[PDB]
Amino acid sequence: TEFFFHTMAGREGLVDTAVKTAETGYMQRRLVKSLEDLCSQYDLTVRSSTGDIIQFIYGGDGLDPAAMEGKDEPLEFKRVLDNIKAVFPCPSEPALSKNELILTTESIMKKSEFLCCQDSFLQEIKKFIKGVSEKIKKTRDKYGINDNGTTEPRVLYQLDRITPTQVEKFLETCRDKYMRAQMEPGSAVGALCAQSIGE
Amino acid sequence: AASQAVEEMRSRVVLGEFGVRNVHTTDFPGNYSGYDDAWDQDRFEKNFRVDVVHMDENSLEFDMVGIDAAIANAFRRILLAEVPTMAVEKVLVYNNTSIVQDEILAHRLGLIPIHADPRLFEYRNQGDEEGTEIDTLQFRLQVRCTRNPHAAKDSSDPNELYVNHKVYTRHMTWIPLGNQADLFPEGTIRPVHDDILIAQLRPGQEIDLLMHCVKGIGKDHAKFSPVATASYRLLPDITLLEPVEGEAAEELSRCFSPGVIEVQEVQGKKVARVANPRLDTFSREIFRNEKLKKVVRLARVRDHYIFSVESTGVLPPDVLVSEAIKVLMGKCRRFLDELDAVQ
Amino acid sequence: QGRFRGNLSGKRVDFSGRTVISPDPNLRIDEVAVPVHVAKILTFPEKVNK
Amino acid sequence: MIIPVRCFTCGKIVGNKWEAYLGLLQAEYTEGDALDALGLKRYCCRRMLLAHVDLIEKLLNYAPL
Amino acid sequence: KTALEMVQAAGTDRHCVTFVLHEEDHTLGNSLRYMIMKNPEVEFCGYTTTHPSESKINLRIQTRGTLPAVEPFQRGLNELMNVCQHVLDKFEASIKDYKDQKA
Amino acid sequence: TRRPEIGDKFSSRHGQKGVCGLIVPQEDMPFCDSGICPDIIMNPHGFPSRMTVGKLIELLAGKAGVLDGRFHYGTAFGGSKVKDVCEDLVRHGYNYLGKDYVTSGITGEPLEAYIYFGPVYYQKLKHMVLDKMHARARGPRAVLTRQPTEGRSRDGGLRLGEMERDCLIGYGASMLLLERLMISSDAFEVDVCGQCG
Amino acid sequence: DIVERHLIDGDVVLFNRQPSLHKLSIMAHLARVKPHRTFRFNECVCTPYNADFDGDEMNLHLPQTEEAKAEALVLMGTKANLVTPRNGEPLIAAIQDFLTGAYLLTLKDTFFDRAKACQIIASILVGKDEKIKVRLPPPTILKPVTLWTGKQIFSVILRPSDDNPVRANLRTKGKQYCGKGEDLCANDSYVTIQNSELMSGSMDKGTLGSGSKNNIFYILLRDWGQNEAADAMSRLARLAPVYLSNRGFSIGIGDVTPGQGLLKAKYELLNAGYKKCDEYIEALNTGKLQQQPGCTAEETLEALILKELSVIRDHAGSACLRELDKSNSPLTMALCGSKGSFINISQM
Amino acid sequence: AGILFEDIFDVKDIDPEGKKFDRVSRLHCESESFKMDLILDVNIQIYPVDLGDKFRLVIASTLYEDGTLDDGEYNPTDDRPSRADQFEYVMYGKVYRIEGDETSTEAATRLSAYVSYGGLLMRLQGDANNLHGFEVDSRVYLLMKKLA
Amino acid sequence: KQAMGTIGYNQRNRIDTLMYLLAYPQKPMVKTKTIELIEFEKLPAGQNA
RNA sequence: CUCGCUUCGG
Ligand SMILES: Nc1ncnc2c1ncn2[C@@H]1O[C@H](COP(=O)(O)OP(=O)(O)OP(=O)(O)O)C[C@H]1O
Ligand SMILES: [Mg+2]
Ligand SMILES: [Zn+2]
Ligand SMILES: [Zn+2]
């Protein structure tokens, strides 16, 4: 009896797969035949074959889903900052205070190369920098670390250690990742959407 | 203590309930602190020994002590593949009427061992399908099955009705080429087993063919392998952590091989001891007994390899082991000569 | 099997083969092993240059 | 169809031990003790002889002759 | 054409070499690796098979100091040959006296 | 007369259809103490997803049967139980669960884990790589539409279906799509009048 | 002049599985000619094609134009399509017998002497890696015995040579993470890689598989380009099988046999569940059964019976997992996530 | 002397969460001179330890007592007077984490150093004064010697 | 259903459009009673490995 | 050859 019930369940699964294959095949054909015309133009506007505009900017932001590192966010700032700290640990430079970190971030962001970057990404970078500066301030307040750089136990400077070289590397890496995460013009956006929905 | 643990790690291979431990060879220079594991030819020559325990025709068993796993495995693999032998390669067929297909018949004929000594021949050159006296042998197989002129009225059994209805390998006749008749005394060149059933016939059917045998190594094809089974196993050493007596000692005698654990009445009570640890096969049935798990410690001696070499009858196994060692020496010599030529 | 779906949108091609696959871990992820028999059949027109 | 000459795994000559095996079955011997008397220690040759079916005579019953 | 040396890079440093041995397999590779690893001057010895289809092995030798990494190779080959000769002699003696005591 | 090779399909009487991926020499195969080297090495990873305990029980029963010269029964909702074959195995000197101490053929050193050895009834399938292997040159074409024929028996070429075209479009490879669907299949040169069309 | 040459090594060739679902079902590879009769490729690329080596046939097209060949190599290169366009997750990653091999290699139990570690590392020195210095890492334990941990051997894959600029960094939670250790989990399931060195944790599907991000190969692709990721994949596919074969990994009937504690627990759970089901049956049949909201009395009984049966099943599974010992191959393959799960183990 | 840290520890627990690994155990230890808690993974197969054992532990920047920090490579075959001659169990690792104590919300003075000897973890926690000289991405030697 | 093996005792005289035979078929070591009932062991379609 | 039909494979 148990064997018969198990076989019933197995045959249910098999017939489910059998019907699903054909149904999704037809849906895939319809979706691709409808969506294949669209293309991401060089003015960042998705246009149909006839020239009509479907979107003024793809995805509202213009970022590639294939290079989408986070959970529908271009970067995971914590991971990037940790990787920058580990790759370039500068042992000959002092750590930065909250005010120093904010000042150097504001100085770097106002350069020309960051102007072409989208304002939302700059706001997110500012928010993350403010959060990490608050973390640094909380740690130094907890352990009584002085921003003068003369606290006797130097190991206390290893708690939340950030240096201007690391800040510059992190900002340049984030800007480069954002620039390289944009839709390359001419990409077959519609076919990608059709396949990524049908599969 | 720590020294005992290190010694067990570097000398013994312990078999646990779920897995084996200390399987890797570790005695290398710099691996251990208090030991100088640098190569010493004198120490190796002092410690190494070979002891033959059983040797009849087509079967040899011997313990090698002091060698390592790599060299023992090299010897085993050379015996399995790199020892040249004599075997059938070419089959020329004249009117094979048998039910057995021609390709199947040729494959069966190739697997038949040949008693010819491989050292007296040479490898046939690339091409040269005709073959010369030096590097080939010819075997004629001509069997014509026909009804027995005198048989009983019923004769249900095929033996009485028919003659030559079973093509045994004794029907193979050696055909000398050139001066091979003078070099080899009669009866030396022949199929090894003399009783292998090649095919089965019915009256009217005939098998006429010639077989060209050439030298080859088991690496090229398994029909050239001289040894039926060439293997080695590490010598077991079962040890008792605490003295086991009473009926549990009889349980010990039943957990292991029949001949390894012996029970003796020293004071009228049965006490168990390791008699012949060699005979054990490590069925690991001592782990089923919950109480007896923690009283024994199954182990293998790392540098004690019992080699069992069962041959196919081409030549006695001692000559096979000698040829394997000489083949390893020849490989080393070939690469040394290449290195000298480079420099 | 009409012209549009069978002969226009998707059509049969030459210079192609179809074979059973087997694993091979010793190859790089960007490489594929091709049988010698297939390679002798599938040809590439190389233009003679300097 | 017919008994293989060699054992598949180990390679021991097993072709010559077939008909004699049948004799042990023509005698009173069981399968296991007949295999033991034939000298097949490891179970691969025992599988070779025990699981072999002799189709050669059944096919020969359909031979031209 | 059987054994070919290949230096670590275009700089031709003798400390790290790769010997490609043709028509060879794990037999000689493993035996030679064991016999050459016991040389104290070898930091890293290791053999690999390029592909099971082709019969060749790559041994890699990396020494400690300034050894040309060919000297340890030749020394390992010589030690393996001497070991094989000694075991052949000992095995022949064991076979012979076993036969003698049998009769 | 065909010999098994790479690509030949093999089954194991339990739905574990497989392809011969590699043919190693005998010496490279692992060996037990008795000297037995396996014919077929099958991956353990196929078991947990498919839960084919029947194959393991069949292997154990076959090992016991060949050891004691018997034919065990795997009858549905019955057959020989595990306890009896375990008792037969322990009586014959082998491990009561089939797992055996094994020495590595390559390195010559014992394996850290016991290996599950036993006779399994493997059956070869008619699907062979020799019959299935196909390669297509320019070859013949169809009269109606001058495209390569359909089947291997007719020396036909492979087909770029609609989804293959969709994937090529998604990649954006315009030149390769043009070459595949126009140049390499049914390229032609017609004469069109620019006046009447 | 045009010469119709044979397909030689290095030719860009399209390779496809005919049931095509997404664009990664067809890719451009580099052809290498081999004597056998089958199309062979690295198994880490099995997941995009959804191939399983059970007789599946694959198609192979040869572009006949330089422009088409270049487009195939650039746009459809395997190194250029490591991440699916649907959500950016890495598709080409380690698979069964690679997750298991790496998980066993990076376990805290592993300890190698110089010889075994040298052999395992030298297993990768083929092809383009023939021209690099090995850079054997310093041993971890050296005074009593000189031992290399498995994690160092695995980290050799990420950064083999001195001149390799790869410095991979990753910090994530494994499948069996307790949730409180934060790199001090009892199960050692918190993965931490600093400068291409495995500091803590054990490799598994969550970090080496094709599931989602936090994959080490995905980190390599996003930080150091495609070539480093492809080389790491090749080194893993060459190293893990060697160690797994030299170590031995087998499944037996005793690996799935139940213990005495599991039998007793299952018997007690079955008795209790059947008693509760009978009580519910009697409550519905004769009298008033407390009706769950939004459903009839019969549906309430069905829900209660399903709940009790699920209780029996999951408690039996918990008991069997608790009584199972380590090195149990089904349990090991379930922990690293290469194949199966705890539900399959409990069922079988 | 390159000794970054040195103290006598007593084991208070061997495996609080079970016998997880055959060769590796997770010792919990407390110091006598200071309140320095130690979480240390050790290989018991080669260097067995017990619940009541008391051992001297030294974390050193270099293995040579003369102060020569030249540790580009280590040769096991090299024989020379080194610190390891005075100890029984020497491991080599990297101090890969420095984390402040978060249990104390304010006015905290406790730190923790996480050192990974190839996956064998050591958390040395206590007063930040004793941890002076500890830096991330710094390679150290652990030397352990059991006492009577 | 697709297993390769012997067809019958007259498989040699029979001429079919496509026939697959096994060189050395062997009866299974673990045989169901259904195998005995249908006499499958007389015409095996596989080998024990 | 064309066409249909079945049986497969996946
Ligand atoms: N009708 C079909 N359409 C598309 N693909 C198919 C079809 N039939 C088989 N396939 C191919 O075979 C694969 C189906 O295997 P899958 O269903 O995942 O395992 P399975 O056949 O259930 O094996 P188990 O029963 O789980 O051992 C996936 C697909 O590429
Ligand atoms: Mg499939
Ligand atoms: Zn055999
Ligand atoms: Zn006109």
Coordinates of C-alpha atoms in Angstrom, one line a residue, chain F:
Chain F
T1 CA 32.1 -6.4 -32.9
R2 CA 32.1 -3.4 -30.6
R3 CA 34.0 -2.9 -27.3
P4 CA 32.8 -0.4 -24.6
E5 CA 34.3 3.0 -24.9
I6 CA 33.8 6.6 -23.9
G7 CA 30.2 7.6 -24.4
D8 CA 28.7 4.1 -24.2
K9 CA 25.5 4.1 -22.0
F10 CA 25.5 1.8 -19.0
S11 CA 22.6 1.0 -16.7
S12 CA 22.5 -0.7 -13.3
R13 CA 19.0 -2.3 -13.1
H14 CA 18.0 0.5 -10.8
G15 CA 17.4 3.5 -13.1
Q16 CA 21.0 4.7 -12.6
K17 CA 21.8 5.1 -16.3
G18 CA 25.3 6.3 -16.9
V19 CA 28.0 7.1 -19.5
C20 CA 31.5 5.6 -19.4
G21 CA 33.4 8.7 -18.6
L22 CA 36.9 7.3 -18.3
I23 CA 38.7 4.0 -18.9
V24 CA 41.7 3.7 -16.5
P25 CA 44.4 1.0 -16.6
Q26 CA 44.0 -1.9 -14.1
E27 CA 47.0 -0.9 -12.0
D28 CA 45.5 2.6 -11.4
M29 CA 42.3 0.9 -10.0
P30 CA 42.2 0.6 -6.2
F31 CA 42.6 -2.9 -4.9
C32 CA 41.5 -4.8 -1.8
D33 CA 43.7 -7.1 0.3
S34 CA 42.6 -10.1 -1.7
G35 CA 43.7 -8.3 -4.9
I36 CA 40.3 -7.6 -6.4
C37 CA 40.2 -4.5 -8.6
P38 CA 36.7 -3.2 -9.5
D39 CA 35.4 -3.2 -13.0
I40 CA 33.0 -0.2 -12.5
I41 CA 33.5 2.7 -10.2
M42 CA 30.2 4.5 -9.7
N43 CA 29.9 7.8 -7.9
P44 CA 28.3 7.8 -4.4
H45 CA 26.7 11.2 -5.1
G46 CA 23.9 9.5 -7.2
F47 CA 22.5 7.9 -4.1
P48 CA 21.3 10.6 -1.7
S49 CA 19.2 12.5 -4.2
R50 CA 17.6 9.3 -5.6
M51 CA 17.6 7.3 -2.4
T52 CA 18.2 4.0 -4.2
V53 CA 18.7 1.9 -1.1
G54 CA 17.7 -1.1 -3.2
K55 CA 21.0 -0.9 -5.1
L56 CA 23.0 -1.1 -1.9
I57 CA 20.9 -4.0 -0.6
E58 CA 21.3 -5.8 -4.0
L59 CA 25.1 -5.3 -3.9
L60 CA 25.3 -6.7 -0.3
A61 CA 23.1 -9.7 -1.2
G62 CA 25.0 -10.4 -4.4
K63 CA 28.3 -10.3 -2.5
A64 CA 26.9 -12.7 0.1
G65 CA 25.5 -15.0 -2.6
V66 CA 28.7 -15.2 -4.6
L67 CA 30.6 -15.8 -1.4
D68 CA 28.4 -18.8 -0.3
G69 CA 27.5 -19.9 -3.8
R70 CA 23.8 -19.0 -3.6
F71 CA 21.3 -16.9 -5.6
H72 CA 19.6 -14.5 -3.2
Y73 CA 16.1 -13.2 -4.1
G74 CA 15.2 -9.5 -4.3
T75 CA 11.5 -10.2 -4.6
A76 CA 9.1 -7.2 -4.2
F77 CA 7.8 -6.8 -0.7
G78 CA 10.0 -9.7 0.5
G79 CA 13.3 -11.3 -0.5
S80 CA 16.4 -12.0 1.6
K81 CA 16.7 -9.7 4.6
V82 CA 19.8 -7.7 5.4
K83 CA 20.5 -9.6 8.6
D84 CA 20.9 -13.0 6.9
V85 CA 23.3 -11.6 4.3
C86 CA 25.3 -9.8 7.0
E87 CA 25.6 -13.1 8.9
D88 CA 26.7 -14.8 5.7
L89 CA 29.3 -12.1 5.1
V90 CA 30.7 -12.3 8.7
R91 CA 30.8 -16.1 8.4
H92 CA 32.9 -15.8 5.2
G93 CA 35.4 -13.5 6.8
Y94 CA 34.4 -10.2 5.1
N95 CA 32.9 -7.1 6.8
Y96 CA 29.3 -7.5 7.7
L97 CA 28.4 -4.3 5.7
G98 CA 30.4 -4.8 2.5
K99 CA 32.8 -1.9 3.3
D100 CA 36.3 -3.2 2.8
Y101 CA 39.8 -1.9 3.6
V102 CA 41.3 -0.7 0.3
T103 CA 44.7 0.4 -0.9
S104 CA 45.0 3.2 -3.4
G105 CA 46.3 1.9 -6.8
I106 CA 48.0 5.2 -7.6
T107 CA 49.8 6.2 -4.4
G108 CA 50.1 2.7 -3.0
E109 CA 48.8 3.9 0.3
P110 CA 45.6 2.8 2.2
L111 CA 42.5 4.8 1.7
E112 CA 41.2 6.7 4.7
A113 CA 37.6 5.5 4.3
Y114 CA 36.4 1.9 3.7
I115 CA 35.1 1.2 0.2
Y116 CA 31.8 -0.5 -0.7
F117 CA 32.7 -3.5 -2.9
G118 CA 30.3 -6.0 -4.4
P119 CA 29.0 -7.6 -7.6
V120 CA 26.2 -5.6 -9.3
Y121 CA 24.2 -6.7 -12.4
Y122 CA 25.1 -4.0 -14.9
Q123 CA 23.4 -4.0 -18.3
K124 CA 24.6 -2.3 -21.4
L125 CA 22.1 -0.2 -23.4
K126 CA 21.8 0.1 -27.2
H127 CA 22.7 3.8 -27.1
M128 CA 26.2 3.9 -28.4
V129 CA 28.4 6.9 -29.1
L130 CA 29.5 5.3 -32.4
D131 CA 25.9 5.3 -33.7
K132 CA 25.1 8.7 -32.3
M133 CA 28.2 10.6 -33.4
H134 CA 27.4 12.9 -36.2
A135 CA 29.4 15.5 -38.2
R136 CA 28.2 17.5 -41.2
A137 CA 30.2 19.1 -44.0
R138 CA 28.5 21.1 -46.8
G139 CA 26.7 17.9 -47.7
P140 CA 23.4 17.6 -49.6
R141 CA 20.5 20.0 -49.6
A142 CA 16.7 19.8 -50.0
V143 CA 15.1 20.5 -53.3
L144 CA 12.2 22.6 -52.1
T145 CA 14.2 24.8 -49.7
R146 CA 17.9 24.6 -50.4
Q147 CA 18.9 23.8 -46.8
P148 CA 20.6 20.7 -45.3
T149 CA 18.5 17.6 -44.8
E150 CA 17.0 16.5 -41.5
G151 CA 18.4 13.2 -40.1
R152 CA 21.7 11.5 -39.6
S153 CA 20.7 8.7 -41.9
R154 CA 20.3 11.3 -44.6
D155 CA 23.6 13.1 -43.6
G156 CA 21.6 16.1 -42.3
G157 CA 22.9 19.0 -40.4
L158 CA 21.9 20.3 -37.0
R159 CA 19.1 22.7 -36.5
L160 CA 19.2 26.2 -35.0
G161 CA 15.7 26.3 -33.5
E162 CA 13.8 29.4 -32.6
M163 CA 15.1 29.4 -29.0
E164 CA 18.7 29.2 -30.3
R165 CA 18.0 32.3 -32.4
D166 CA 16.5 33.9 -29.3
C167 CA 19.6 33.2 -27.3
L168 CA 21.8 34.6 -30.1
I169 CA 19.7 37.7 -30.2
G170 CA 20.0 38.1 -26.4
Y171 CA 23.7 37.9 -26.7
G172 CA 23.5 40.6 -29.4
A173 CA 25.8 38.7 -31.8
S174 CA 24.4 40.1 -35.0
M175 CA 27.2 38.9 -37.3
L176 CA 27.2 35.4 -36.0
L177 CA 23.4 35.1 -36.3
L178 CA 23.7 36.4 -39.9
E179 CA 26.5 33.9 -40.7
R180 CA 24.7 31.0 -39.2
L181 CA 21.2 31.6 -40.6
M182 CA 22.1 33.1 -44.0
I183 CA 25.7 32.4 -45.1
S184 CA 26.1 28.9 -43.8
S185 CA 22.6 27.5 -44.6
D186 CA 20.8 28.9 -47.6
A187 CA 22.8 31.8 -49.0
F188 CA 21.7 32.8 -52.5
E189 CA 22.1 35.6 -55.0
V190 CA 18.9 36.8 -56.8
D191 CA 18.3 39.5 -59.4
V192 CA 15.8 42.2 -58.4
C193 CA 14.5 44.8 -60.8
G194 CA 14.8 48.3 -59.1
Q195 CA 11.9 49.6 -61.3
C196 CA 9.1 47.1 -60.9
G197 CA 10.4 45.6 -57.6

